[PDB]
Amino acid sequence: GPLQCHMQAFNANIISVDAYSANDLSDKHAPLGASGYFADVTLTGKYHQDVFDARHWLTMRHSGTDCRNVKGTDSKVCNIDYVENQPGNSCAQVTQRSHLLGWSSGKALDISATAPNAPVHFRASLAPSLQTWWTGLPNTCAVQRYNAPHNPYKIVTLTASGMHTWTKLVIMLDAPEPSFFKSWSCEYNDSLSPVVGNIQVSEDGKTYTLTNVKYQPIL
Structure with a gap:
């Protein structure tokens, strides 16, 4: 499978994550309808060899294709009216999966191949009073809240199926951990x-900041 790397808090909890995902997953020379690579930033409560095996996970996924080619975005592409389907488009979407509550696809943001080349800004942030997580892409329509899980998030996992750079990752803890x-x-x-x-x-x-996290082919 794709490469997955993670950092894990043990006594502290993860209370906020921002991830900036470079626009490098799509192919402007591919035919219409083709898919490219994808990259996720995922939050979980327990360790898993494959993070998506977890009974509960919350992911912020960047896909190198128009949202129209990403299954589960039907009626959820909140800026569908402003982005013509085109080769080289990209898609950003939050999804929470829970073996108890179900597969909950969040709002998806379509990104034009003609838009200025810039990283995609995902954010997941806990509102401790609300007991809910704000999720999505700040300053866009693709935003929703998810209820906090029974086991608080302690692991952040970065996954990509191909060469990809997260230009910036900001993880915030409710308490310091030097082991993080x-x-x-x-x-x-x-x-x-x-x-x-x-x-x-x-x-x-409290705040760990990673710059230029790159997954690249070995050979």
């Missing part, structure tokens, strides 16, 4: 390998 820095580990596929441009930590030890 070194919890980085992958389920390797001997096909892609990771490299991180830079990792920083805030003064209070």
